[PDB]
Amino acid sequence: PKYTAKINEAEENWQARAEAIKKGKKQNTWDLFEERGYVKDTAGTKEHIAELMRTRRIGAYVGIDPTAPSLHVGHLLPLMPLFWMYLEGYKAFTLIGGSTAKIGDPTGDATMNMTKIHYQLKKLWENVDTQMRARGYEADWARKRGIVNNNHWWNKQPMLEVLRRVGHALRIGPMLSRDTVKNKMTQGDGVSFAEFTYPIMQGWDWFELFYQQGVQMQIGGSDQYGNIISGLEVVKAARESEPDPQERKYVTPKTALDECVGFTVPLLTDSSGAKFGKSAGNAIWLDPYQTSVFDFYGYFVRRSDQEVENLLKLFTFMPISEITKTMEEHIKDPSKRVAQHTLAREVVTLVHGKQEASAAEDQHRMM
Amino acid sequence: PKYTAKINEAEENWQARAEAIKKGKKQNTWDLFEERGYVKDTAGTKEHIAELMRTRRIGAYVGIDPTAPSLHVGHLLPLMPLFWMYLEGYKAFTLIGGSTAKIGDPTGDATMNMTKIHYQLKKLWENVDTQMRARGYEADWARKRGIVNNNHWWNKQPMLEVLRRVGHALRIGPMLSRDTVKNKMTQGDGVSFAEFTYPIMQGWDWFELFYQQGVQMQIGGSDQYGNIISGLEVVKAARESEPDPQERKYVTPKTALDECVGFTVPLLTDSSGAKFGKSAGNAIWLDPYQTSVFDFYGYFVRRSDQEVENLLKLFTFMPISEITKTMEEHIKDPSKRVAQHTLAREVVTLVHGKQEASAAEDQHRMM
RNA sequence: GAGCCUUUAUACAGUAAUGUAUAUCGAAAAAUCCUCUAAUUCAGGGAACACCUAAACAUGUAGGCAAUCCUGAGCUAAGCUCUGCGGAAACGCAGAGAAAGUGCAACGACUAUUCCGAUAGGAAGUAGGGUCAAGUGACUCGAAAUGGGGAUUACCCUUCUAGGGUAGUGAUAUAGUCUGAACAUAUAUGGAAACAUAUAGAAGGAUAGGAGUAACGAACCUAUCCGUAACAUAAUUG
RNA sequence: GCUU
């Protein structure tokens, strides 16, 4: 139909792009991730990954365990590179763990929570867009974002399906041997069949997104590597055992590049020692009635000049080009901290919109 | 309603019989069990299972995975006691693993494979019922038999629920400490996620049966012992997990009577140090066009002059009483196989009808 | 809406009327009698209405409800066919089967009566219920095959008096009695909701016992769980 | 033409 018409039209567009990158005419979204520091580890030839990106209009996602009734800054890290991918035209999504929470990542009223979170996420996009169009970005039809909920399928997802479609492929070996969890049995109480299986699901999720949305990438927590790997395995397993001949033409690991890869953003902390996201005790929440807009503006303007550089490139949607401009201005007057007042205002916008974020500057820049 | 009064009828009688055992008048089903040597191991108190069988028309089943196109003579023994219970007036079942086959018990097309067994169990049951009334057995309203496919439910069993309804109380520790496993990892190969779950499955199955009919007792192969244990585990957590309380009022283990016990038949192997089912050129099946009636008949007519005894108790619904009589004629002439004919015939007749029982004996009676 | 037959069309089927198949159609229908009504459970899969809901997903969907199409296990009244024994006959017993019914009523419970009528129904007051009394009393309702099996009939066909075929679905509840069914409810689990399931609802109600009986019942005695919030209400609906 |  006419719908398929625009689809193929997009392919070409994405090729003029794949071209520019070929002759370094435009940076590779991947080398963009290296330019702001979003790469800690990689489950997929750092290089390969790159090509897979310059080339195809791939997709990715970021999962969030709806355990808290609000996300905190610590989640903003991994969502950034996603966002960027979005700004380029890829297919990005944010998977909510509505069901997974019920088990929880064994790394080491529930509705009410799950609910809030959803909305909390859409809001961001609502701003990422406003931001995207504003900071000078072009309208791409094919471009694709969205919010999913692992429950959507897991709620009825029969076990026979899973246990068979992949159960024969995995082996408790590189599972029970997994340090993160294995360590839990030794140095801990132990583990519930749920926990042991949690990964397995995290992998059925990745696949679901591939099978249901063409996802060849997953961005996650620094500690989520051990998971991103195990997921992978599960991903493929299903693609392999596709008992459908006409559907094998899809899912089955065709071309070499047709491989799902991922990358764990780095684990950050404050110039001192306190882990990132936490503050004295709790954390830098996002929920206004739990972290006033002011306080928010605070933990950001707080960061000293030692990190402002590395952390400025991490949480702002600003061309490193213009970044060094703000930084080169700040360094000629560290005391006044022009760079700290700006970086803070910038991130408060994205999450809390300009209108407020601007007023919030008045408070903290007053007296 | 009338139907109501009916269930009550059989109920009352059950107490009359509960008394006979209480005042020595009829062997408690379970005594007839350990007596005819059907028992080798037990999960629950020897007296526990006793009392329960005195005051409860409990339900019990025998699991059978359709991995082969025919039930081999081995599958008899385990079923045998079951049949007896049906005879005494219980709730007995035979479970078909039409889905668990893609997994199988770990220890060390296919669609029709199952079909074959279906038709089987049936026809068999028929004769069981047949011989029953055939020999002074008064039917009972409450006495019921039946077969049930395991896919019956697995076909669409929600992963989420399951995992929760029991995973939150199961540790992969002891679940992996079962030797059956440790070996299937150290020695030999490895243990997949799938097969790892078989123990849980067979456990759930039980739960089902306990729910859909009132089956609170498993009867498995001499080796299936472990499963009988790992299974019972899932069983408990299940009756607890039940969300709606009102239901819990029934489904949850209230008094010590609502205790589900399971026992395992012995390991019966021929005087050939080989399972009593993996002998001959490969095995000894029931399928006529896979094991000549004659050849079958033989498997019995020829057996240890000593074995006859305990072999009659295990494969013939012959009253202990005249069972010894057969031993009277036999000993007057060891090499005459007087008892071997009677014990051989029984088996054939049971799994092949009287008409054949004779026809076979004839061939095995020539010059 | 859906099914039945029905108009016509083709199609595989036959000795042929006719048979099965899809679609179209509606122009008149759609024989009688007798006998059986037991079992009444455990799941499973699908579904027209446009019929409520709208949390997701980009009105499209989706979940619910549902006329209702079925499958597995078990069970079942009188017959049915194969084989074995009995018989003179019947039928009997045995086993192998082949229909068919529960399952598959508005959540269910319960019953297969006479008379008259072209029917709808009318009269009986049986079957079996409801209410009040307390005792074997009053009062008030009040009735089904539309299936299974066996006959008879008429019909036309005929490889033409001997076979063959045609004489509709309707019971996933029909009659009818009840009714926790009916509540946009209360409650509790499950859902975002619509809902589904379980109790309960004009302080009582429910089940399991004690006693006592000729037996059931009223009333007593024990325990138990439900409410103790307003509606349940009378037509009316399966 | 009838039917739940």
PDB file of C-alpha atoms in Angstrom, chain A residues 46-164:
ATOM      1  CA  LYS A  46      32.659  -2.390  19.634  1.00  0.00           C
ATOM      2  CA  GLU A  47      33.404  -2.016  15.938  1.00  0.00           C
ATOM      3  CA  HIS A  48      30.693  -4.282  14.543  1.00  0.00           C
ATOM      4  CA  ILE A  49      28.139  -2.422  16.630  1.00  0.00           C
ATOM      5  CA  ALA A  50      29.251   0.750  14.889  1.00  0.00           C
ATOM      6  CA  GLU A  51      28.671  -0.581  11.403  1.00  0.00           C
ATOM      7  CA  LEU A  52      25.348  -2.077  12.405  1.00  0.00           C
ATOM      8  CA  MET A  53      24.406   1.554  13.316  1.00  0.00           C
ATOM      9  CA  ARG A  54      25.821   3.544  10.430  1.00  0.00           C
ATOM     10  CA  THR A  55      24.144   0.931   8.187  1.00  0.00           C
ATOM     11  CA  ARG A  56      20.659  -0.246   9.222  1.00  0.00           C
ATOM     12  CA  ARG A  57      17.958   1.843  10.902  1.00  0.00           C
ATOM     13  CA  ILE A  58      18.201  -0.449  13.951  1.00  0.00           C
ATOM     14  CA  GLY A  59      16.305  -0.219  17.205  1.00  0.00           C
ATOM     15  CA  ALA A  60      17.023  -0.463  20.936  1.00  0.00           C
ATOM     16  CA  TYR A  61      15.434  -0.134  24.369  1.00  0.00           C
ATOM     17  CA  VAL A  62      16.008   0.463  28.094  1.00  0.00           C
ATOM     18  CA  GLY A  63      14.278  -1.492  30.844  1.00  0.00           C
ATOM     19  CA  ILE A  64      13.141  -0.018  34.127  1.00  0.00           C
ATOM     20  CA  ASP A  65      12.092  -2.079  37.144  1.00  0.00           C
ATOM     21  CA  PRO A  66       8.913  -0.346  38.382  1.00  0.00           C
ATOM     22  CA  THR A  67       9.805  -0.968  42.018  1.00  0.00           C
ATOM     23  CA  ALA A  68       9.942   2.749  43.002  1.00  0.00           C
ATOM     24  CA  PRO A  69       7.033   5.145  42.481  1.00  0.00           C
ATOM     25  CA  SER A  70       9.484   7.386  40.645  1.00  0.00           C
ATOM     26  CA  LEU A  71      12.728   7.167  38.734  1.00  0.00           C
ATOM     27  CA  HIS A  72      15.748   9.009  39.945  1.00  0.00           C
ATOM     28  CA  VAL A  73      18.596  10.643  38.081  1.00  0.00           C
ATOM     29  CA  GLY A  74      20.538   7.335  38.019  1.00  0.00           C
ATOM     30  CA  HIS A  75      18.187   6.199  35.223  1.00  0.00           C
ATOM     31  CA  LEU A  76      18.746   9.365  33.170  1.00  0.00           C
ATOM     32  CA  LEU A  77      22.205   8.161  32.225  1.00  0.00           C
ATOM     33  CA  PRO A  78      21.232   5.156  30.077  1.00  0.00           C
ATOM     34  CA  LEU A  79      18.217   6.919  28.621  1.00  0.00           C
ATOM     35  CA  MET A  80      20.344   9.643  27.093  1.00  0.00           C
ATOM     36  CA  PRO A  81      22.091   7.502  24.450  1.00  0.00           C
ATOM     37  CA  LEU A  82      18.685   6.044  23.650  1.00  0.00           C
ATOM     38  CA  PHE A  83      17.347   9.556  23.182  1.00  0.00           C
ATOM     39  CA  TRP A  84      20.247  10.470  20.962  1.00  0.00           C
ATOM     40  CA  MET A  85      19.531   7.395  18.817  1.00  0.00           C
ATOM     41  CA  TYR A  86      16.001   8.748  18.644  1.00  0.00           C
ATOM     42  CA  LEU A  87      17.228  12.110  17.519  1.00  0.00           C
ATOM     43  CA  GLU A  88      18.927  10.283  14.648  1.00  0.00           C
ATOM     44  CA  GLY A  89      15.818   8.426  13.458  1.00  0.00           C
ATOM     45  CA  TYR A  90      16.258   4.928  14.872  1.00  0.00           C
ATOM     46  CA  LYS A  91      13.556   2.953  16.737  1.00  0.00           C
ATOM     47  CA  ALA A  92      13.871   3.388  20.462  1.00  0.00           C
ATOM     48  CA  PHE A  93      11.685   2.196  23.294  1.00  0.00           C
ATOM     49  CA  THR A  94      11.555   2.187  27.073  1.00  0.00           C
ATOM     50  CA  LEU A  95      10.453  -1.171  28.491  1.00  0.00           C
ATOM     51  CA  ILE A  96       8.705  -1.055  31.829  1.00  0.00           C
ATOM     52  CA  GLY A  97       9.087  -4.138  33.985  1.00  0.00           C
ATOM     53  CA  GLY A  98       5.511  -4.138  35.270  1.00  0.00           C
ATOM     54  CA  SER A  99       5.776  -7.872  35.818  1.00  0.00           C
ATOM     55  CA  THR A 100       9.509  -8.213  36.344  1.00  0.00           C
ATOM     56  CA  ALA A 101       9.309  -5.992  39.417  1.00  0.00           C
ATOM     57  CA  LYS A 102       7.309  -8.865  40.971  1.00  0.00           C
ATOM     58  CA  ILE A 103      10.551 -10.880  40.922  1.00  0.00           C
ATOM     59  CA  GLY A 104      13.172  -8.154  40.694  1.00  0.00           C
ATOM     60  CA  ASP A 105      16.639  -8.112  39.202  1.00  0.00           C
ATOM     61  CA  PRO A 106      18.637 -10.540  41.367  1.00  0.00           C
ATOM     62  CA  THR A 107      21.815  -8.496  40.898  1.00  0.00           C
ATOM     63  CA  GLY A 108      23.463  -8.760  44.294  1.00  0.00           C
ATOM     64  CA  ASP A 109      -0.219  -1.858  45.331  1.00  0.00           C
ATOM     65  CA  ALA A 110       2.736  -2.509  43.081  1.00  0.00           C
ATOM     66  CA  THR A 111       0.359  -1.124  40.452  1.00  0.00           C
ATOM     67  CA  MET A 112       0.493   2.337  41.925  1.00  0.00           C
ATOM     68  CA  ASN A 113       4.190   2.273  41.298  1.00  0.00           C
ATOM     69  CA  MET A 114       4.079   0.791  37.778  1.00  0.00           C
ATOM     70  CA  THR A 115       1.450   3.425  36.912  1.00  0.00           C
ATOM     71  CA  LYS A 116       3.311   6.533  37.963  1.00  0.00           C
ATOM     72  CA  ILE A 117       6.495   5.333  36.267  1.00  0.00           C
ATOM     73  CA  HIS A 118       4.742   4.859  32.919  1.00  0.00           C
ATOM     74  CA  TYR A 119       3.503   8.389  32.817  1.00  0.00           C
ATOM     75  CA  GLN A 120       6.840   9.616  34.281  1.00  0.00           C
ATOM     76  CA  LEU A 121       8.506   8.107  31.205  1.00  0.00           C
ATOM     77  CA  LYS A 122       6.139   9.519  28.578  1.00  0.00           C
ATOM     78  CA  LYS A 123       6.638  12.974  30.099  1.00  0.00           C
ATOM     79  CA  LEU A 124      10.339  12.725  29.298  1.00  0.00           C
ATOM     80  CA  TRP A 125       9.673  11.941  25.639  1.00  0.00           C
ATOM     81  CA  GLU A 126       7.139  14.791  25.623  1.00  0.00           C
ATOM     82  CA  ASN A 127      10.203  16.928  26.400  1.00  0.00           C
ATOM     83  CA  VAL A 128      12.773  14.997  24.385  1.00  0.00           C
ATOM     84  CA  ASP A 129      10.601  15.866  21.360  1.00  0.00           C
ATOM     85  CA  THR A 130      10.071  19.529  22.325  1.00  0.00           C
ATOM     86  CA  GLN A 131      13.811  19.510  22.808  1.00  0.00           C
ATOM     87  CA  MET A 132      14.615  17.635  19.568  1.00  0.00           C
ATOM     88  CA  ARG A 133      12.635  19.906  17.290  1.00  0.00           C
ATOM     89  CA  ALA A 134      13.862  22.968  19.178  1.00  0.00           C
ATOM     90  CA  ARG A 135      17.650  22.234  19.348  1.00  0.00           C
ATOM     91  CA  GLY A 136      17.413  22.004  15.592  1.00  0.00           C
ATOM     92  CA  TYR A 137      16.382  18.541  14.392  1.00  0.00           C
ATOM     93  CA  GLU A 138      14.580  17.396  11.234  1.00  0.00           C
ATOM     94  CA  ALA A 139      11.202  15.733  10.995  1.00  0.00           C
ATOM     95  CA  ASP A 140      11.758  12.103   9.987  1.00  0.00           C
ATOM     96  CA  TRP A 141       8.717   9.988   9.231  1.00  0.00           C
ATOM     97  CA  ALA A 142      10.339   6.618   9.854  1.00  0.00           C
ATOM     98  CA  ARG A 143      11.655   7.891  13.207  1.00  0.00           C
ATOM     99  CA  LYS A 144      10.256   5.797  16.028  1.00  0.00           C
ATOM    100  CA  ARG A 145       9.899   6.010  19.804  1.00  0.00           C
ATOM    101  CA  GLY A 146       7.524   4.477  22.367  1.00  0.00           C
ATOM    102  CA  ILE A 147       6.843   2.976  25.789  1.00  0.00           C
ATOM    103  CA  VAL A 148       6.337  -0.732  26.387  1.00  0.00           C
ATOM    104  CA  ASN A 149       5.400  -2.870  29.342  1.00  0.00           C
ATOM    105  CA  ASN A 150       6.896  -6.363  29.681  1.00  0.00           C
ATOM    106  CA  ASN A 151       3.613  -7.358  31.337  1.00  0.00           C
ATOM    107  CA  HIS A 152       1.823  -6.921  27.973  1.00  0.00           C
ATOM    108  CA  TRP A 153       2.906 -10.428  27.004  1.00  0.00           C
ATOM    109  CA  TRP A 154       4.230 -11.991  30.252  1.00  0.00           C
ATOM    110  CA  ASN A 155       0.748 -11.780  31.728  1.00  0.00           C
ATOM    111  CA  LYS A 156      -0.471 -14.537  29.474  1.00  0.00           C
ATOM    112  CA  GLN A 157       2.868 -15.775  28.130  1.00  0.00           C
ATOM    113  CA  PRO A 158       2.650 -19.546  28.462  1.00  0.00           C
ATOM    114  CA  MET A 159       5.630 -21.341  29.916  1.00  0.00           C
ATOM    115  CA  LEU A 160       5.494 -24.227  27.472  1.00  0.00           C
ATOM    116  CA  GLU A 161       6.287 -21.694  24.748  1.00  0.00           C
ATOM    117  CA  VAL A 162       9.364 -20.334  26.520  1.00  0.00           C
ATOM    118  CA  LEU A 163      10.721 -23.480  28.136  1.00  0.00           C
ATOM    119  CA  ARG A 164      10.654 -25.030  24.675  1.00  0.00           C
TER     120      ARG A 164
END
